[PDB]
Every structure is written in C-alpha cells, then in structure tokens.
Symmetry: none
Subunit: 24 residues, 3 copies
C-alpha cells in the first residue's frame, strides 16, 4: 500500500491590515 | 514513503482598527 | 507508492493594526 499522508502544509499569509482608526 | 507536505494555509484574519487620527 | 498530500497548513496570523484615522 501507499505510504502515509504528508505533513501539514506551511502556515498561511499574515492577515490584511485593519481599517483606519477612529477620528481624532 | 510519506506524501508531500500539504498546501499553504489560508490568509490570517484582518487586523485591529488603527489608532485615533489627529485632533480636528 | 508515495502517500498523498498532507492537510492544508494552519491559518496565518492576524494582520497588523490599521493606519491612523485620517487627518480631518
């Protein structure tokens, strides 16, 4: 039979920047 | 033999809101 | 034969804080 499944993949990309902050 | 590493994970979550803007 | 691909990798880390609120 085939070998075992491979390792998990690499971690994903950093998330997007958040939205602009509140008005001053 | 073990299979290949899996695909990259998904992109992270959107970041926090930024800090307050300038006075005015 | 080689095994199959591993699972998708972990989700990426949270994104950075947004920019400061806009002038005015």
């Amino acid at each position: 039979p085939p070998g075992p499944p491979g390792p998990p993949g690499p971690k994903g990309e950093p998330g997007p920047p958040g939205p602009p902050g509140p008005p001053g």
